[PDB]
Amino acid sequence: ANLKSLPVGDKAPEVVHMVIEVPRGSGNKYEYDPDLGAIKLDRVLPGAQFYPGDYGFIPSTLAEDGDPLDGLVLSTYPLLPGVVVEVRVVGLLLMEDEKGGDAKVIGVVAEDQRLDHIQDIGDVPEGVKQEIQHFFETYKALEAKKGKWVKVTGWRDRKAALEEVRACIARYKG
Amino acid sequence: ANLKSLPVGDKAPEVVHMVIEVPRGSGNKYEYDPDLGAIKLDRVLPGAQFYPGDYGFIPSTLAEDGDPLDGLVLSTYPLLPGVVVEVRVVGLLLMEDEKGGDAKVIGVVAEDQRLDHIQDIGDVPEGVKQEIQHFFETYKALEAKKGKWVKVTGWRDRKAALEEVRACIARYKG
Amino acid sequence: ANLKSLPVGDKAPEVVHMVIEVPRGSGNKYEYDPDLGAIKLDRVLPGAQFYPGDYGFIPSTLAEDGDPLDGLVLSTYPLLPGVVVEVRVVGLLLMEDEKGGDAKVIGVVAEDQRLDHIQDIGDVPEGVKQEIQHFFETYKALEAKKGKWVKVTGWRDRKAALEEVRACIARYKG
Amino acid sequence: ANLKSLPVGDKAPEVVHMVIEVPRGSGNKYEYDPDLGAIKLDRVLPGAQFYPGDYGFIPSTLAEDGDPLDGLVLSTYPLLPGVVVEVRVVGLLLMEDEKGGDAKVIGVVAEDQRLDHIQDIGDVPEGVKQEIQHFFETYKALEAKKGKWVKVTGWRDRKAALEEVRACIARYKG
Amino acid sequence: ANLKSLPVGDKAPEVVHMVIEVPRGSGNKYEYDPDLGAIKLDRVLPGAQFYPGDYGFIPSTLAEDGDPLDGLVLSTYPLLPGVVVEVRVVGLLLMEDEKGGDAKVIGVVAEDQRLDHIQDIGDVPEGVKQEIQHFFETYKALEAKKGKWVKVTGWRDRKAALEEVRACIARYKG
Amino acid sequence: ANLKSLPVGDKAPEVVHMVIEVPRGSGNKYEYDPDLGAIKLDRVLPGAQFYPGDYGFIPSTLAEDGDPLDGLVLSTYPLLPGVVVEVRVVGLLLMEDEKGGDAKVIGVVAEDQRLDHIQDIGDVPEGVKQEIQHFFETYKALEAKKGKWVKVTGWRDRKAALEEVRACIARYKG
């Protein structure tokens, strides 16, 4: 259709719809292209790395950067590009990249009983939070000479995330 | 498009079109959502299980339960969500679930020479039929407290299946 | 949408858009069906084989055989059916099949730094070129009794490929 | 060598050596055979299931049943049959099987920072504990007619587990 | 230990021990090396192929070619190099290779209920037998210039296979 | 046996024996333990990374650090822990780690026709060399607080590597 304009979901902002672009464990950086109306390969990560969780965007949201709000989902099994999943929001990852400031939503697959226990950011084990941060700090390292860069600023809890979700939802309506 | 309304196929009812929702070997229960027009994750199975064959529905059919007729396909290699495959009908799996009675079609990938020998239900090895039944009898066991349940009634041959296919085809035209 | 009519790309003919039908390493021969508007399974290869690279077609091109121009991509990680990737053209594989003459484009994922060194056909290692040829010469061997056949004629360099790309692009406009 | 007689480890009983027999996610039930001195396939699970964690035994221990003490490990990535890993003991799974009473040790890979947070049984999410229990209650269901059976009695904490580890260690020395 | 001298098994010749060298689905041609006492990589198949079933040898047997008797096993899930599995003998594959005449045993994993129905060669579906034959006729095709070759002579039933098993068992005792 | 004392091979130093410890694509850092005589898990890498090639050691060699000479192999398909493979030496990776100076051998699977073209370090594509270096510079980043560190010094050609191989071979004899 036009995945970027799917409804954000009825349980929003606590539980939102997310379009998965990159499965967890993948080094193939895919993206949904509204113009082509299909998933395109943006690039293959240059280092021996993979996304630490499933990556996608929240449909019908607009970040301050003009794109929908992005997020990383903790899943039991990696998802596939282009599928829609209800995600429970538990936190934010703040970072500064080439382009500017940025905040990514941290969520868990809402319909997986194995994760019912992750309700706030303090619930994501720190071994996992360190893996995520280290990913974002090195994954664009081989693309420096291409002017890409990233710095991780810090983490925020479920209350802060919901406020950002709400604001990107409003902004999209505008 | 709208996968639920694709043509059932020219060789129907003997050979029908099927939209695959869940690959064999997957614990990610996906479903096609006509309203969203995309594959959505309905849920992750709570137990350490996986679909014993590829699961999907027959487009342009309507079961007595108001949904298209569902079915399980025996394949050499697991398929992917959202692909269309011609399936040869060889039997029925009768079951009673929370909601009510139900019959699933048992089929084989029509264009795979390794399976040309499976022509009727008596051709599906019983080690395989037991695996299928045991799947449907335990997979919703951890979702009891959520009011889900299932009981397997029995198996039917290719003649019975064709009659149900024909009837759900008619009913869809209505 | 209609993947066959997506734009061929701005960097064409040197760098073109390709719709992936079969991932590298797959024995599931998928194809995009414009009529159904979905990926369908054409068949499962009968032998214990898999595509030596990702297979798909160039959108908005028309070969002399009336279909878009087909091609094989060298990738670091197998792609998925239905995704669009920018491919750098480095050569041609000429062959004669049941139906007739045929030329397939040989390309590399354009946005993968691990492959930046493959710029012409002479850059594809010959151990790899032999694997490709042997694939096309035996993969339809079990489908002879079904009147399918193939013979590999030879390889052509990036200059020849570009000329064919350009010609199938023109022809599509017609 | 003789994996059953490897040292239990210096940090025992808190951290013990474990010989992995079945990787997590596997349906191939392997076992180490001291007599043959190799990993043998005991059987393929009859249902569409897989071990919910890596399964193996503690070397140089003897349970009341005459075999070494068995255990299930929570890992980030499945292990391989025959490798030795240091496992941190956090709990016990009590069960009754055909043969008799039984207690399995629940542990986590000791050298994986992503799991440093699992220190006692109350730390294993209950969605995970339910998956484990349901596995042991249904996995031998298709082997009933072969006189196999299992009932899960309950869970015990790290203090109880250590006591059993210590006792099977002593008993082995005997 | 010395896998080549493990016991052939108590249920021999009907059910024999087999040391798996190459998992089904693998292109890595491993072999057990008695001299090194370890699994070594003999070579990577040059074509885009994989073993159609798990390959290994029967311990304590000696073929007319001076090596133990080789065989191909039909399994539900690929096995791993160096594991021992009880295999039920159902047939023979006769072939002529560079070196000479040769007969491979065709078997099924004995302890997998999904295969209990394969009791003689006539039970291996012909789509499967064609895949096996085509494998052996093309897999050494890229190694011709290295003087390797193979021709498949025909298939034999469980009675013929047992006779060969018995004879290679006797011969080993010698 | 004792993998550390296997023969280095007859074609040494040009082609050497290597015991694989970590498959390419793995995050499970295994090691052969002579004392236990088995493969043990040393640790799970803390970041979302994997070895860029298969890692192991050359048997019957002794580096200046008292351990056998280590190396990274370029393979078509990842290998398994504990298998022996003949590796063709094409270069050296010099680095400084916590402990001290270090040089790793860079090799290719000798019996894989797809790699026959990699004969010297200048033949390893630079997209690949950058991936390797970036791996070694970040993989121990989350283990800093554990006093681990690494710096990559540079690369050396096949002539330099052979000299180091020869020297570690001599030293082992001592």
Side-chain angles (χ1 to χ4, degrees), chain D residues 3-80:
Chain D
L3 309 178
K4 288 178 15 134
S5 59
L6 282 200
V8 64
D10 288 313
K11 303 173 221 204
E14 291 68 24
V15 183
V16 299
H17 277 149
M18 268 192 47
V19 184
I20 294 326
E21 285 169 323
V22 191
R24 163 155 65 69
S26 177
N28 277 337
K29 213 287 188 196
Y30 295 117
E31 272 180 2
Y32 173 77
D33 194 313
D35 285 349
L36 292 181
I39 263 96
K40 184 172 81 90
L41 175 93
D42 179 69
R43 75 191 180 275
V44 184
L45 300 180
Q49 307 173 91
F50 59 75
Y51 271 75
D54 311 88
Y55 183 83
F57 69 81
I58 303 186
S60 290
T61 60
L62 188 39
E64 270 135 47
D65 73 1
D67 277 309
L69 183 64
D70 274 340
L72 205 80
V73 187
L74 303 194
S75 42
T76 296
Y77 312 123
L79 305 160
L80 276 168

Side-chain angles (χ1 to χ4, degrees), chain A:
Chain A
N2 200 328
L3 309 178
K4 288 178 15 134
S5 59
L6 282 200
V8 64
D10 288 313
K11 303 173 221 204
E14 291 68 24
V15 183
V16 299
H17 277 149
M18 268 192 47
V19 184
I20 294 326
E21 285 169 323
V22 191
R24 163 155 65 69
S26 177
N28 277 337
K29 213 287 188 196
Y30 295 117
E31 272 180 2
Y32 173 77
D33 194 313
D35 285 349
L36 292 181
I39 263 96
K40 184 172 81 90
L41 175 93
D42 179 69
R43 75 191 180 275
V44 184
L45 300 180
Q49 307 173 91
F50 59 75
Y51 271 75
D54 311 88
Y55 183 83
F57 69 81
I58 303 186
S60 290
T61 60
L62 188 39
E64 270 135 47
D65 73 1
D67 277 309
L69 183 64
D70 274 340
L72 205 80
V73 187
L74 303 194
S75 42
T76 296
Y77 312 123
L79 305 160
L80 276 168
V83 315
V84 178
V85 35
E86 287 159 275
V87 168
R88 172 162 93 253
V89 189
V90 308
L92 279 184
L93 177 58
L94 302 180
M95 50 177 48
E96 318 267 59
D97 69 344
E98 39 183 338
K99 298 298 161 75
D102 188 22
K104 292 193 177 321
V105 166
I106 299 301
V108 281
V109 168
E111 298 289 332
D112 181 345
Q113 296 184 45
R114 292 172 200 81
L115 309 166
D116 278 353
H117 58 105
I118 307 178
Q119 296 272 331
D120 210 333
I121 199 64
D123 295 328
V124 172
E126 221 223 353
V128 179
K129 284 196 273 232
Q130 286 185 138
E131 186 189 23
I132 298 166
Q133 169 160 353
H134 168 270
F135 168 84
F136 285 107
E137 289 182 334
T138 55
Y139 92 122
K140 276 182 175 194
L142 298 173
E143 272 164 358
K145 67 179 161 297
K146 305 198 159 171
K148 303 190 176 197
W149 60 256
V150 175
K151 210 230 180 137
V152 156
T153 276
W155 299 83
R156 298 290 175 266
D157 74 348
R158 182 197 54 209
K159 306 190 164 77
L162 302 172
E163 279 314 315
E164 167 86 5
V165 182
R166 271 190 174 95
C168 296
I169 285 166
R171 181 169 326 103
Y172 175 88
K173 307 213 262 227

Side-chain angles (χ1 to χ4, degrees), chain B residues 77 113-114 117 125 127 130-131, chain E residues 113-114 117 125 127 130-131:
Chain B
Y77 312 123
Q113 296 184 45
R114 292 172 200 81
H117 58 105
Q130 286 185 138
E131 186 189 23
Chain E
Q113 296 184 45
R114 292 172 200 81
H117 58 105
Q130 286 185 138
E131 186 189 23

Side-chain angles (χ1 to χ4, degrees), chain C residues 50 76-77 113-115 117 125-128 130-131, chain F residues 50 76-77 113-115 117 125-128 130-131:
Chain C
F50 59 75
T76 296
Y77 312 123
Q113 296 184 45
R114 292 172 200 81
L115 309 166
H117 58 105
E126 221 223 353
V128 179
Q130 286 185 138
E131 186 189 23
Chain F
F50 59 75
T76 296
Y77 312 123
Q113 296 184 45
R114 292 172 200 81
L115 309 166
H117 58 105
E126 221 223 353
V128 179
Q130 286 185 138
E131 186 189 23

Side-chain angles (χ1 to χ4, degrees), chain E residues 10-67:
Chain E
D10 288 313
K11 303 173 221 204
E14 291 68 24
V15 183
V16 299
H17 277 149
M18 268 192 47
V19 184
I20 294 326
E21 285 169 323
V22 191
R24 163 155 65 69
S26 177
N28 277 337
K29 213 287 188 196
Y30 295 117
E31 272 180 2
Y32 173 77
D33 194 313
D35 285 349
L36 292 181
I39 263 96
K40 184 172 81 90
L41 175 93
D42 179 69
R43 75 191 180 275
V44 184
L45 300 180
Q49 307 173 91
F50 59 75
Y51 271 75
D54 311 88
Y55 183 83
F57 69 81
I58 303 186
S60 290
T61 60
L62 188 39
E64 270 135 47
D65 73 1
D67 277 309

